[PDB]
Ligand binder design. Sequence first.
Ligand SMILES: [Mg+2]
Ligand SMILES: [Mg+2]
Ligand SMILES: [Mg+2]
Ligand SMILES: [Mg+2]
Ligand SMILES: [Mg+2]
Ligand SMILES: [Mg+2]
Ligand SMILES: [Mg+2]
Ligand SMILES: [Mg+2]
Ligand SMILES: [Mg+2]
Ligand SMILES: [Mg+2]
Ligand SMILES: [Mg+2]
Ligand SMILES: [Mg+2]
Ligand SMILES: [Mg+2]
Ligand SMILES: [Mg+2]
Ligand SMILES: [Mg+2]
Ligand SMILES: [Mg+2]
Ligand SMILES: [Mg+2]
Ligand SMILES: [Mg+2]
Ligand SMILES: [Mg+2]
Ligand SMILES: [Mg+2]
Ligand SMILES: [Mg+2]
Ligand SMILES: [Mg+2]
Ligand SMILES: [Mg+2]
Ligand SMILES: [Mg+2]
Ligand SMILES: [Mg+2]
Ligand SMILES: [Mg+2]
Ligand SMILES: [Mg+2]
Ligand SMILES: [Mg+2]
Ligand SMILES: [Zn+2]
Ligand SMILES: [Zn+2]
Lengths: 53, 157, 73, 92, 100
Amino acid sequence: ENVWFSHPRRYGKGSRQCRVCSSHTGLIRKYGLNICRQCFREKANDIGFNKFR
Amino acid sequence: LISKKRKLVADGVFYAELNEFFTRELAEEGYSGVEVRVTPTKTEVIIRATRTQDVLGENGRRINELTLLVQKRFKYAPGTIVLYAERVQDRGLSAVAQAESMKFKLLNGLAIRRAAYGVVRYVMESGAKGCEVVVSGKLRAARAKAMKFADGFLIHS
Amino acid sequence: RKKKVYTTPKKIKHKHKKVKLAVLSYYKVDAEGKVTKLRRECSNPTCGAGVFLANHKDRLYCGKCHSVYKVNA
Amino acid sequence: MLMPKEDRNKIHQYLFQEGVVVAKKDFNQAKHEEIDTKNLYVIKALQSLTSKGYVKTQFSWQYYYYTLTEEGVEYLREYLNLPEHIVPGTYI
Amino acid sequence: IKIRITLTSTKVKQLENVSSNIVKNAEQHNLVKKGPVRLPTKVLKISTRKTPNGEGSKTWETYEMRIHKRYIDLEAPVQIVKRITQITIEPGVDVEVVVA
RNA sequence: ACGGAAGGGCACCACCAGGAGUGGAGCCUGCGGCUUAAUUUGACUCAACACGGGGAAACUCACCAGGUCCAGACACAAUAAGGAUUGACAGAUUGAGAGCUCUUUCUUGAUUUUGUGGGUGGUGGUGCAUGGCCGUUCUUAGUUGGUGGAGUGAUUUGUCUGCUUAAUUGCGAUAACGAACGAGACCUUAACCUACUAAAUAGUGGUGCUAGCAUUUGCUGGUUAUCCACUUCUUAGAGGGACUAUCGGUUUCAAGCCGAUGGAAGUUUGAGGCAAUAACAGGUCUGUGAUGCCCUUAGACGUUCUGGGCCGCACGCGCGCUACACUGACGGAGCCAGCGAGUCUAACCUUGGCCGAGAGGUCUUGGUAAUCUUGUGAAACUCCGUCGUGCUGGGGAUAGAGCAUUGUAAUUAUUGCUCUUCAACGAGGAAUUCCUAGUAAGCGCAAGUCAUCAGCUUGCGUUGAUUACGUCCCUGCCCUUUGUACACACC
Ligand SMILES: [Mg+2]
Ligand SMILES: [Mg+2]
Ligand SMILES: [Mg+2]
Ligand SMILES: [Mg+2]
Ligand SMILES: [Mg+2]
Ligand SMILES: [Mg+2]
Ligand SMILES: [Mg+2]
Ligand SMILES: [Mg+2]
Ligand SMILES: [Mg+2]
Ligand SMILES: [Mg+2]
Ligand SMILES: [Mg+2]
Ligand SMILES: [Mg+2]
Ligand SMILES: [Mg+2]
Ligand SMILES: [Mg+2]
Ligand SMILES: [Mg+2]
Ligand SMILES: [Mg+2]
Ligand SMILES: [Mg+2]
Ligand SMILES: [Mg+2]
Ligand SMILES: [Mg+2]
Ligand SMILES: [Mg+2]
Ligand SMILES: [Mg+2]
Ligand SMILES: [Mg+2]
Ligand SMILES: [Mg+2]
Ligand SMILES: [Mg+2]
Ligand SMILES: [Mg+2]
Ligand SMILES: [Mg+2]
Ligand SMILES: [Mg+2]
Ligand SMILES: [Mg+2]
Ligand SMILES: [Zn+2]
Ligand SMILES: [Zn+2]
């Protein structure tokens, strides 16, 4: 039908989702990476992020 | 035409997605990590694994299909992406190879202690200074509790 | 989850199965042996005289130009 | 799932030509890259293929990497009515 | 002819190796140049709760990515320019050359 | 383990001497309770309550009243191209150009539909079945093998009387010797380099052209293709530098401690990151395409559309913002930072010009960013003035009316602006929190979330005090000795 996915998702938490976990809450939208923070804490040392202080 | 910041974080994300894809697909070939080198004329992806013959396949069939999959997903042009495979230096000194070895052993049905002690023996015989293997979960019991196998000396700080 | 009552009218009512009549697509035929035509067809060059329009009542409804033809004889 | 024969044949011939296929896990996308077919039809055709042993799958960050086997390539060969040793995605 | 070459990596010693081999190539070919301009490194900070859930003591975590950027300006014929871009590349180092 | 037992030593999540306060008032926000169709839910001492990065219009969303769709793969059987099945103009119906369903017939043609089996999906349950992560016990200094020794043994010694240390840090003593982990070392960061490398994407000086005042040299400025030179400031890269150096005291005269001089720096230089063994039946299946079992699985707890709700209010708590005024409010001038973010197949940070009281609008411009926004000309602050101890020009809640922006949509006002309204509050009771130097406190600024919305957090810098430099009185931590009818261990 023409009402299956009609509601707009041009913005809001429904427009974004994790590129790993398909989650809407907990996003890091910084630097255009768009990862939930849990998955970010997993994949950070791979991405090139590291703790120094 | 992208900021250098976003360029580099996208490089990191590309590496991470490749790593998870390869550790999901090539678990049974001994996938022990990967490297990426950008270049004019192409970018190349150097897998480091153990069963290079199985990663290659017959006439490089698997390399071909994996190259094409990467090209299709990350929207590279055909030929701008290259894959090489390499017999990894120091199999024993790979945290992930031994981990997947434990996984396959326990899944085929080997025992916890036999598997872990075989692994730590192989590591320490492979020229390592220390090792430590932990197995948490449900062990012969509904209640969960950890086992910790060790040899040599490790540091934590 | 406590329990479901469906206070709505219990009207599980899903539609027809494209109701299966006998053979159809009758144009008409003569005795010895000419053919004749029912189901006045479209006016569109996109419909190459292969589709029938409909005639529900007060309107003729199309099938290839699936809705764009409406003026009633 | 139900879908038009021409769409399924687009899927199957693209798959025979390329050897593999990718489909972002975005239902209601309505337009797959490299195939004008609906993304849902891509996914579900490949699903019906998987369950009968032909093609295999990985999800991998919501992307559904699909890749076919020898049973798959011979089945697609006799399906698309193509000659023996026509071409797989296995050229050097 | 006035090219600029920028090097926008994270690995400082790989970057400095590239800068060094480039400049010694420049001086063995006897090319005047503005030396390696080391721009200020920029630190992509990301601050997050360590925990997935909400409870616990509110402990925070600042991950950092250090981006080190350098550039060199050269005056040279395009033949030596193209072979220069043909040489002097490293893993984990992003380079770009620009004319004028 | 515990002790209202001892001995020694530690801590501003403890006290002392004090500072700012909170609790008192209005408001914000979270929790409970109450109410409700639903007001989704987890968490309840420290170790829940501005936490879930949770600042919810719709989505988020899981809840409520309702309505669609099937994304039920695959195998078998059934029906079945004289048709399996799909879709549909208009009307009724419906919130609804949802055929959802019905009327009426048109359309399509093997993909389907029905049944069986079997899966799939689930922010459904179980965090007491689990993983992983996190927090805490525990920010303290503690932990454990090997070989010997003691003991029938559980176990012990080593791992210590003393002295010292932030420190099982060390001097040393010694039935233990030799080791490992932890601490330390280390890594990052901030402070020094007129020593090196350089740099119109950072500067400085000079010389060209040029504005103004003085003119007598000069002073302040402008200047992109005027070039020349330099790197003190600024950036980084490679290095150096401090190791308690030197001196005097004091200690078996050892580890070390105090003072003074020098020095950028002499509280392990300052702040952090990583951070042991053993555990909690701590939290989380609502982050996971991490997950076992149970439940449900086509009028589904799947998925999605509309509209509500999570904000709901007789009350009780917590984190906070505003202030209760002259060390002040207001109007003018003055006028100074730092950390950082930013547009691609997009539409971001926006300068400048114009309009408008204002918010804001519009025409252009720069920037993928040491280059442009941005000297982010921030705020408190300083100088001039108005007011003048009056719940007063303090305070600015609660209301009314209008104008703009975001967004499909703001109605239980999203926010912003204008005018008017002008409530408590007159320094906060029992109680209680944080803090020892560029620290508290005041002050605002960037980012995070983000279409819009900061009163929150994460960091940044501007101004910058007082009072200890000590003790174990309270609350607790460590070590030892001691006692114990405790062992899920003084609840
Ligand atoms: Mg003290
Ligand atoms: Mg006191
Ligand atoms: Mg206050
Ligand atoms: Mg505590
Ligand atoms: Mg809804
Ligand atoms: Mg909602
Ligand atoms: Mg638990
Ligand atoms: Mg757990
Ligand atoms: Mg013994
Ligand atoms: Mg004995
Ligand atoms: Mg012993
Ligand atoms: Mg000049
Ligand atoms: Mg001395
Ligand atoms: Mg330190
Ligand atoms: Mg979990
Ligand atoms: Mg649901
Ligand atoms: Mg709430
Ligand atoms: Mg709090
Ligand atoms: Mg003023
Ligand atoms: Mg600045
Ligand atoms: Mg006032
Ligand atoms: Mg903001
Ligand atoms: Mg809101
Ligand atoms: Mg918040
Ligand atoms: Mg207290
Ligand atoms: Mg007694
Ligand atoms: Mg007992
Ligand atoms: Mg008692
Ligand atoms: Zn994720
Ligand atoms: Zn027609």
